[PDB]
């Protein structure tokens, strides 16, 4: 189907405790495949998936070099942003960046990304046209002016249409055993009495990949969106994900409730009920 490659970066200053900590991770879809942590004993880009391990030593040297360089630029950027926002040097601040590309089933570029946040708030974002910028405030406008001057967007566009798509393609082939396999959810409904008058029906989805999933309850065919407790999709730790949805049900009305599951590992959407 469709696929994505994404690189995430976080720098966190810690005045009085050394230089800002830099952590970057790379993903294909929901599979972590590389990481770099400046606090590691001997910081290097490290493999986190079997299909990337075959890349040669020059690959790992290059990616390590790029990450170290990004850690350095983030550190001077954090000093710059203190100036832009008239902030003291006493506090801890955060710079986050994500970039990457989405491709369709034919491997063609669907769209690219490159966007920043400072202290958890949107800072500057490359627009979908891969040629213009959206700056969140007058500080980010200074970055925009600099990046327009240096034609940064044109560099990014070339990468996002070029290497990003080409290497995602390469990774998808080398890890086709896993990257191109969807694991459907294993599903069941459980029943937990609350009182003489009510019980909880909990619809479970377990062991699925990728993370995207739709879990809903209907009562008499009506969506129960407002009354459904829906937990965040969570990692199991073994590449797969978990999710549940729960409704509180008057006793004796269990059979009016149906759980509905959509997932790309399922040929057809599922319907399930409490089975006493």
């Amino acid at each position: 189907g469709s696929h994505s490659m994404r690189y995430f970066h976080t720098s966190v200053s810690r005045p009085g405790r050394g230089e800002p900590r830099f952590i970057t991770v790379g993903y294909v879809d929901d599979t972590l495949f590389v990481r770099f942590d400046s606090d590691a004993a001997s910081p290097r880009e490290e493999p986190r998936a079997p299909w990337i391990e075959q890349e040669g030593p020059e690959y790992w040297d290059r990616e390590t070099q790029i990450c170290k360089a990004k850690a350095q630029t983030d550190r001077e950027d954090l000093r710059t942003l203190l100036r832009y926002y008239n902030q003291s040097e006493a506090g801890s601040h955060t710079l986050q960046n994500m970039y990457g590309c989405d491709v369709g089933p034919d491997g063609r570029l669907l769209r690219g990304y490159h966007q920043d946040a400072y202290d958890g708030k949107d800072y500057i974002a490359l627009n979908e046209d891969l040629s213009s910028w959206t700056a969140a405030d007058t500080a980010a406008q200074i970055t925009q002016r600099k990046w327009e001057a240096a034609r940064v967007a044109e560099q990014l566009r070339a990468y996002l249409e070029g290497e990003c798509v080409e290497w995602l393609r390469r990774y998808l082939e080398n890890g086709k055993e896993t990257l191109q396999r969807a694991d459907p959810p294993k599903t069941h409904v459980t029943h937990h009495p609350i009182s003489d008058h009510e019980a909880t029906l909990r619809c479970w989805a377990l062991g699925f990949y990728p993370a995207e999933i739709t879990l809903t309850w209907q009562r008499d065919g009506e969506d129960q969106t407002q009354d459904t407790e829906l937990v965040e999709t969570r990692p199991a730790g073994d590449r797969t994900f978990q999710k549940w949805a729960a409704v509180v049900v008057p006793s004796g009305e269990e059979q009016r409730y149906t759980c509905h599951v959509q997932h790309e590992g399922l040929p057809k959407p599922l319907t399930l009920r409490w089975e006493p």
Binding site: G26, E63, C67, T80, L81, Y99, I124, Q155, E163
Partner: peptide
């Protein structure tokens, strides 16, 4: 593979 042009400062 990462974007590897010379990094541009904010």
């Amino acid at each position: 593979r990462r974007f590897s042009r010379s990094p541009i400062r904010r």
